[PDB]
Amino acid sequence: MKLKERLAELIPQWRAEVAEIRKKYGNRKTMDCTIGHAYGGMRGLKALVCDTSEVFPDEGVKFRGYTIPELREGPHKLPTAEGGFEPLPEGLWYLLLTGELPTEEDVKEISAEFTKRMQNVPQYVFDVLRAMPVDTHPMTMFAAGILAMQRESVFAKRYEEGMRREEHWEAMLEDSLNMLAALPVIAAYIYRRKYKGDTHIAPDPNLDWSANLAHMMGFDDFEVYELFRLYMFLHSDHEGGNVSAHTNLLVNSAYSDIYRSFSAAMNGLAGPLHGLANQEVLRWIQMLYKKFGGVPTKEQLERFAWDTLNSGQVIPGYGHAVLRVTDPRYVAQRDFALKHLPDDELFKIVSLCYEVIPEVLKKHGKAKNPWPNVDAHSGVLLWHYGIREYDFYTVLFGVSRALGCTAQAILVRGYMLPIERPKSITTRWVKEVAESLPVAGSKLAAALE
């Protein structure tokens, strides 16, 4: 497989480069660490490495240095399905791993690997899934199904047999191919059992990875296939620092295989502070529709927005802290909606918010960002095509985020980064010593530097 031969050349080089960097720049200061970081969830602390993606405040997320527009339409467009427009996640995965753009044949090899492997989900995984009570939350089922498949881990098997550190990335890759192929099968099983009367649809060996998820959930529509391709592409990766990506890296750092690291990550994604944002946006849009007996006018939405902001509250999906521009993942979703469901009533509200809410936020004066993120837009797209089971939205997010998690996990085992092991501090120590400590950026801090 091309992906593998290429990595066999790039990874030895990256490994050497990283060893040199740690040697010659290890002592370079990036910032001050504060009491505030320790009690404030490490916010802003430059404590991890991720090379798959990178957020620029003035551009949004890039994938190995390419913008979403370059990959989606521009001059570096990734391969699509036959007759499709939307980029295939398979090709994006090639890019995240290698840092190089795939050829059509590269993508097809990855698609065939996925299609083949998607037939290899162990029967006992479904036994595990069926032993869980059907009212179990779908993210609990998703994580459990993944973890049960740890029995099939090549990394775990090869590690116990004795393999060189240099082979770690090979085993991580094999495991990632198996796990990624399995994810849509597990996800669809959960969907069909909980919400569609426990009737089950087999993978179509002539569909790509994203489309097969839609197929197996029971949604056979070209538009739905295209939405799922775009959705999986957009949500694939967002740096290393979010709870689920970080959980993945942390468990990975102890040499736990991808079934263990990624199921752990899904337990983090299942958290209400990490995995529900898209659902909350959608329920808000729906609350506006019902409040206004239909699409609100520009004046009604303005007033409702002022009422919300003046009463200390925020508007879901808008005004997050980092970007100074619209999330490029939002823009691609809007472009999809304009093309494919412009008259859908909930979309009309999301569209009006894109006009109105940024104008209101500029005027209100708090947010150095008046613009939306990805979660502002995704829910109405799912809901339009009949995917209405809110709890399950987090599972779709999880399937997508597996692309970036698997890439990250393969790369860091290629780099041979060590176990993650920060130092914790006690409140006792803090209370004793805090007076003694300089204010960060102060003249005293400069003195004690």
Ligand X SMILES: CC(C)(COP(=O)(O)OP(=O)(O)OC[C@H]1O[C@@H](n2cnc3c(N)ncnc32)[C@H](O)[C@@H]1OP(=O)(O)O)[C@@H](O)C(=O)NCCC(=O)NCCS
Which active-site residues does the annotation give?
A: 274, 320, 375
Looking at 78, 81, 96, 148, which residue binds a copy of itself (CB under 8 A)? 148
* DSSP-assigned beta bridge partners for residue 60: 56
Looking at 37, 367, 385, 389, which residue binds ligand X (CB under 6 A)? 367
Whether 149 and 372 have beta carbons less than 8 Å apart is answered as: no
Q: Is 43 in the site for ligand OAA (CB under 6 A)?
A: no
Draw the binding track, 392-421, toward ligand OAA (x: CB under 6 A; -: no contact): -----------------------------x
Q: Is 418 in the site for a copy of itself (CB under 8 A)?
A: yes
Q: Is 133 in the site for a copy of itself (CB under 8 A)?
A: yes
Tokens of 69: 């527009």
CA distances from 254 to 93, 151, 418 (A): 24, 18, 8
Tokens of 169: 């990335």
Looking at 12, 44, 342, 386, which residue binds a copy of itself (CB under 8 A)? 44
Q: SS3 of 53, please?
A: strand
* DSSP-assigned beta bridge partners for residue 53: 63
Instruction: Report d(CA 274, CA 290) in Å as an integer.
Output: 27
Q: Which stretch binds ligand X (CB under 6 A): 29-37, 88-96, 348-356, 368-376?
A: 368-376
Q: Which does 319 bind (CB under 5 to 8 A by kind): ligand OAA, ligand X, a copy of itself, none?
A: ligand X
Tokens of 273: 């502070």
Burial of 261 (0-12, 13-18, 19+ CB in 10 A): buried
Query: Dihedral through CA 405, CA 408, CA 411, CA 415, nearest 10?
Result: -130
CA distances from 151 to 175, 265, 274 (A): 11, 18, 28
Looking at 184, 240, 316, 404, which residue binds ligand X (CB under 6 A)? 316
Instruction: Report d(CA 295, CA 442) in Å as an integer.
Output: 52
Q: Provide, rounded to whole angstroms, the least separation between the CB of residue 55 and a copy of itself.
A: 9
Site for ligand OAA in 219-258 (CB under 6 A): 238-239, 241-242
Of the two residues 178 and 394, which places its CB atom closer to ligand OAA in the complex? 394
Looking at 12, 22, 112, 363, which residue binds a copy of itself (CB under 8 A)? 22
Q: Is 414 in the site for ligand X (CB under 6 A)?
A: no
Q: Is 366 in the site for ligand X (CB under 6 A)?
A: yes
Point out which residues bind ligand OAA (CB under 6 A).
238-239, 241-242, 321, 421
